[PDB]
Amino acid sequence: WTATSGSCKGRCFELQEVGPPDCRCDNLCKSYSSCCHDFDELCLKTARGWECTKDRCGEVRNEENACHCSEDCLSRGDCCTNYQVVCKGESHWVDDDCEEIKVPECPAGFVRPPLIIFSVDGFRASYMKKGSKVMPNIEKLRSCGTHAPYMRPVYPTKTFPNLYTLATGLYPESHGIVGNSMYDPVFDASFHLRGREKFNHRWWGGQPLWITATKQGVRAGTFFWSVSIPHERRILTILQWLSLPDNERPSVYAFYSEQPDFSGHKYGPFGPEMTNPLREIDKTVGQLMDGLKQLRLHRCVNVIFVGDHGMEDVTCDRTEFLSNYLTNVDDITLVPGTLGRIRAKSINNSKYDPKTIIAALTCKKPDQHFKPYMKQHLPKRLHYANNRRIEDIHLLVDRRWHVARKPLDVYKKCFFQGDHGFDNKVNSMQTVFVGYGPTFKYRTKVPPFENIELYNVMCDLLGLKPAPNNGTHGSLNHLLRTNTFRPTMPDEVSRPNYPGIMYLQSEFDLGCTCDDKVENKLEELNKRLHTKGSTKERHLLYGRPAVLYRTSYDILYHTDFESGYSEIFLMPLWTSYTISKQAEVSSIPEHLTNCVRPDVRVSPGFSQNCLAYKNDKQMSYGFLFPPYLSSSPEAKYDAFLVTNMVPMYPAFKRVWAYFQRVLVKKYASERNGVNVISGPIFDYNYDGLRDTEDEIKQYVEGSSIPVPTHYYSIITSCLDFTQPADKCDGPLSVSSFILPHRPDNDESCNSSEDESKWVEELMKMHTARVRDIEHLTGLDFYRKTSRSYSEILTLKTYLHTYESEI
Ligand SMILES: *[C@@H]1O[C@H](CO)[C@@H](O[C@@H]2O[C@H](CO)[C@@H](O[C@@H]3O[C@H](CO[C@H]4O[C@H](CO)[C@@H](O)[C@H](O[C@H]5O[C@H](CO)[C@@H](O)[C@H](O)[C@@H]5O[C@H]5O[C@H](CO)[C@@H](O)[C@H](O)[C@@H]5O)[C@@H]4O)[C@@H](O)[C@H](O[C@H]4O[C@H](CO)[C@@H](O)[C@H](O)[C@@H]4O[C@H]4O[C@H](CO)[C@@H](O)[C@H](O)[C@@H]4O)[C@@H]3O)[C@H](O)[C@H]2NC(C)=O)[C@H](O)[C@H]1NC(C)=O
Numbered sequence: 001w002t003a004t005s006g007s008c009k010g011r012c013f014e015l016q017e018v019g020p021p022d023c024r025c026d027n028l029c030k031s032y033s034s035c036c037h038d039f040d041e042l043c044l045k046t047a048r049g050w051e052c053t054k055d056r057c058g059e060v061r062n063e064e065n066a067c068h069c070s071e072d073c074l075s076r077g078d079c080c081t082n083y084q085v086v087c088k089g090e091s092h093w094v095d096d097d098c099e100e101i102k103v104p105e106c107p108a109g110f111v112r113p114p115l116i117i118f119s120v121d122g123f124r125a126s127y128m129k130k131g132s133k134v135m136p137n138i139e140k141l142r143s144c145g146t147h148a149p150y151m152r153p154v155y156p157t158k159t160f161p162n163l164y165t166l167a168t169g170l171y172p173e174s175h176g177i178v179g180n181s182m183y184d185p186v187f188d189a190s191f192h193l194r195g196r197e198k199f200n201h202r203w204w205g206g207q208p209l210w211i212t213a214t215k216q217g218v219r220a221g222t223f224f225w226s227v228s229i230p231h232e233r234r235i236l237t238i239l240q241w242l243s244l245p246d247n248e249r250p251s252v253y254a255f256y257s258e259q260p261d262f263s264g265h266k267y268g269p270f271g272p273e274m275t276n277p278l279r280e281i282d283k284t285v286g287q288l289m290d291g292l293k294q295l296r297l298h299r300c301v302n303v304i305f306v307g308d309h310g311m312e313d314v315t316c317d318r319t320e321f322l323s324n325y326l327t328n329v330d331d332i333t334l335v336p337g338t339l340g341r342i343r344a345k346s347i348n349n350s351k352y353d354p355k356t357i358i359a360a361l362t363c364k365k366p367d368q369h370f371k372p373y374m375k376q377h378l379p380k381r382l383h384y385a386n387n388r389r390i391e392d393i394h395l396l397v398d399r400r401w402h403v404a405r406k407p408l409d410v411y412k413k414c415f416f417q418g419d420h421g422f423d424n425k426v427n428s429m430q431t432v433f434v435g436y437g438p439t440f441k442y443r444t445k446v447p448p449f450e451n452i453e454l455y456n457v458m459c460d461l462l463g464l465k466p467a468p469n470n471g472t473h474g475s476l477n478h479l480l481r482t483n484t485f486r487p488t489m490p491d492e493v494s495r496p497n498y499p500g501i502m503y504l505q506s507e508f509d510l511g512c513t514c515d516d517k518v519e520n521k522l523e524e525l526n527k528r529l530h531t532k533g534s535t536k537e538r539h540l541l542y543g544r545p546a547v548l549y550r551t552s553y554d555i556l557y558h559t560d561f562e563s564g565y566s567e568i569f570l571m572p573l574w575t576s577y578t579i580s581k582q583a584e585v586s587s588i589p590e591h592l593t594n595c596v597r598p599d600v601r602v603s604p605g606f607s608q609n610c611l612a613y614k615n616d617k618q619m620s621y622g623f624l625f626p627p628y629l630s631s632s633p634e635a636k637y638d639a640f641l642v643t644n645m646v647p648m649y650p651a652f653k654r655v656w657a658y659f660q661r662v663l664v665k666k667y668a669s670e671r672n673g674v675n676v677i678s679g680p681i682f683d684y685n686y687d688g689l690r691d692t693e694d695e696i697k698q699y700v701e702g703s704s705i706p707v708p709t710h711y712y713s714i715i716t717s718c719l720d721f722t723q724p725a726d727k728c729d730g731p732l733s734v735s736s737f738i739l740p741h742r743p744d745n746d747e748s749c750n751s752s753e754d755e756s757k758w759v760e761e762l763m764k765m766h767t768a769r770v771r772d773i774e775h776l777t778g779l780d781f782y783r784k785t786s787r788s789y790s791e792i793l794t795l796k797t798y799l800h801t802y803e804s805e806i
Pocket residue numbers: 170171173174175176202203204205206383386387388468469470687688689775
């Protein structure tokens with residue numbers, strides 16, 4: 001109950017929320033059905049509309065008006081945004097040439113440049129080019145400020161997960177808003193778009209920007225707007241807040257538009273009905289910028305124009321139905337649409353089996369438009385697993401499609417022509433970023449980046465220390481004129497050992513064999529140097545990775561490759577090698593097919609053994625440095641060392657062998673040499689972070705050889721590809737992957753065919769940032785380059801998406 005008989009007199013859009021049953025006057029009171037009786041009358045005035053006219057100029061103040069054209073309005077902070085244009089002969093902001101803003105130009109008493117976040121729902125990245133004719137205000141922000149060709153949203157590419165990611169810097173799995181709809185099994189409560197439960201604070205994890213600001217003594221406007229408050233009123237409220245006394249005036253503000261998303265759902269992303277919504281958004285931006293100019297704030301405020309996600313063409317007829325796959329359809333609950341999430345309808349049903357459900361949904365129809373996954377097998381780049389609100393069974397739905405349980409769900413629950421929620425690498429889901437103000441750069445284009453990075457930057461803009469988050473602080477320093485964040489490289493925690501020859505062959509009883517006993521100061525002085533690290537400069541181009549946790553490991557040097565070998569996990573944490581454009585692929589000689597060789601630098605007790613692999617009927621092995629790429633027949637013996645060996649299922653060896661035999665050479669040809677760092681990843685609890693030894697759920701049968709959940713590779717070359725990878729004077733180019741180490745290839749419906757028809761497609765799906773690999777390994781790469789650290793952090797956050805041009 002609310003005692004709605006209080007009054008909003010002088011309280012309109014109050015910044016502090018009053019505790020019920022006292023009636024409210026803040027911009028959210030409508031949503032809670034809690035506004036005072038006179039809120040509409042006093043706070044949502046519409047009389048005379050939103051614009052000054054020639055004859056309204058100089059008028060006598062009439063408090064009933066929506067905005068004012070009287071002489072006193074500027075000091076009152078409540079003129080219509082076009083007052084000075086109409087009445088004082090000013091130009092609109094958009095008609096003014098842009099001029100570099102080298103310093104904040106602010107009224108006296110402003111302690112810092114305010115930040116205004118202008119967020120647009122469903123604003124697809126290609127609207128910037130495609131709608132540019134009808135968006136002159138936005139086009140001026142974009143060309144005069146700092147802009148990216150697009151910004152990558154988080155998965156799922158829905159509204160709430162993305163807006164909350166913008167506010168927190170966290171993946172949805174960490175912030176807890178994992179969809180627009182959710183069931184939390186611990187609360188036993190459901191979260192929905194409509195309804196009351198979503199207002200409960202227990203759903204919302206991490207620390208959003210307005211809380212970060214408040215705690216650190218920076219005042220914030222209220223970020224959320226009830227839908228029925230028109231856009232013109234949102235703008236005038238912000239402009240009014242900016243006229244408050246110094247001690248009361250917020251420093252950070254947000255505006256939200258439900259457009260163009262709202263019309264996009266109805267008409268598709270490029271429906272002819274989409275032009276009007278883009279015009280209206282531009283007009284709103286114009287109103288803000290005119291209002292700012294009037295207040296002498298247009299060269300003071302930093303403005304961010306940002307979207308939550310794009311919009312794709314999707315129609316009713318493009319729906320897959322689980323009823324065409326499952327016999328047991330009524331025993332499941334599906335969260336439907338542009339993603340699928342499945343759980344048991346009843347926790348009392350002991351005959352529910354996720355394994356049989358997954359199998360029934362796997363590669364069943366020729367052009368099947370969704371792929372089922374256990375959540376821990378989803379591409380690691382989605383970071384979509386580590387939350388109890390994410391169901392074990394997930395469906396990744398093809399762009400342009402929906403999944404639903406039964407046909408009746410679609411026509412008894414065509415309306416829409418657009419939707420979103422798909423994989424966050426999909427071009428149509430990409431959204432926008434523009435930064436304009438004294439703190440952003442002038443007329444600068446920056447590369448695409450992820451929206452998880454923005455929280456840090458908004459903190460930088462306000463002089464705040466960011467709460468712990470998933471951005472990489474410093475990676476967006478190149479967007480900023482000043483207020484950059486200058487991080488230091490993390491300190492290495494464990495130093496390596498550098499073992500020499502310490503064991504005789506006969507001390508090893510590993511069950512391993514090799515036809516290598518076939519016999520000189522030319523070549524023996526030479527081989528000793530290689531084992532002391534003489535070629536290390538060629539194969540370790542960016543310094544050795546730093547180990548950021550406590551462990552015991554050895555550096556092992558070889559002619560063709562260098563490794564950091566873990567005595568704890570009994571295999572390399574990383575193996576580094578360079579393959580020049582000129583390098584040649586050779587085969588594994590017949591006599592060496594099953595050769596595994598003891599490493600006389602590493603004790604038997606810290607080695608793998610071949611007997612375990614023989615005994616384990618499910619597990620085989622592969623090598624991190626590929627024997628195919630040995631520099632000479634004698635160097636090839638090094639690739640068969642037991643310390644270069646790692647556990648691999650036969651199904652996975654198909655993937656790995658093709659990558660090593662074919663793909664590495666291909667990238668070296670195309671990229672003018674590559675440097676490759678490969679290694680294992682252990683993430684049994686799917687938290688995106690390196691597992692400790694006591695977290696490993698699987699070993700090679702009868703041994704302490706732990707089985708990786710994933711295998712990574714980081715592939716680096718010169719951005720200027722006229723320079724060879726090992727002789728690069730400037731910026732680097734990277735692509736990486738984190739391949740799931742699976743005992744079957746069920747994920748690839750074409751896997752019965754030649755590796756050339758399905759393996760590269762698998763790898764592209766499992767594309768990754770170096771940063772993702774750092775989290776998963778506790779390693780820190782690119783420690784020794786001639787590049788600035790900020791540039792390297794940008795490089796580490798890069799994602800190669802394999803999408804065509806936006
Ligand atoms: C992306 O960035 C984020 C932010 O940096 C990273 O997430 C952090 O990861 C940390 C390392 O895992 C984690 O640290 C743990 O915190 C525990 C206390 O956490 C509470 O307090 C913080 C601070 O205010 C708060 O943020 C947390 O909020 C979480 O939980 C609530 C309620 O569930 C949610 O509302 C909220 O959304 C958020 O949930 C998310 O995180 C939790 C994990 O905390 C997940 O379970 C959820 O799925 C969701 O993703 C909390 O309110 C602290 O107790 C931990 O310490 C235990 O574990 C360590 C192991 O190192 C051990 O040393 C300790 O002894 C202790 O163990 C004891 O408890 C164990 C479990 O009960 C038990 O097994 C043992 O036997 C012991 O009894 C730990 O320090 C930190 O909380 C999160 N922060 C956030 C915001 O998520 C994230 O890793 C980044 N991702 C990537 C890929 O880089």
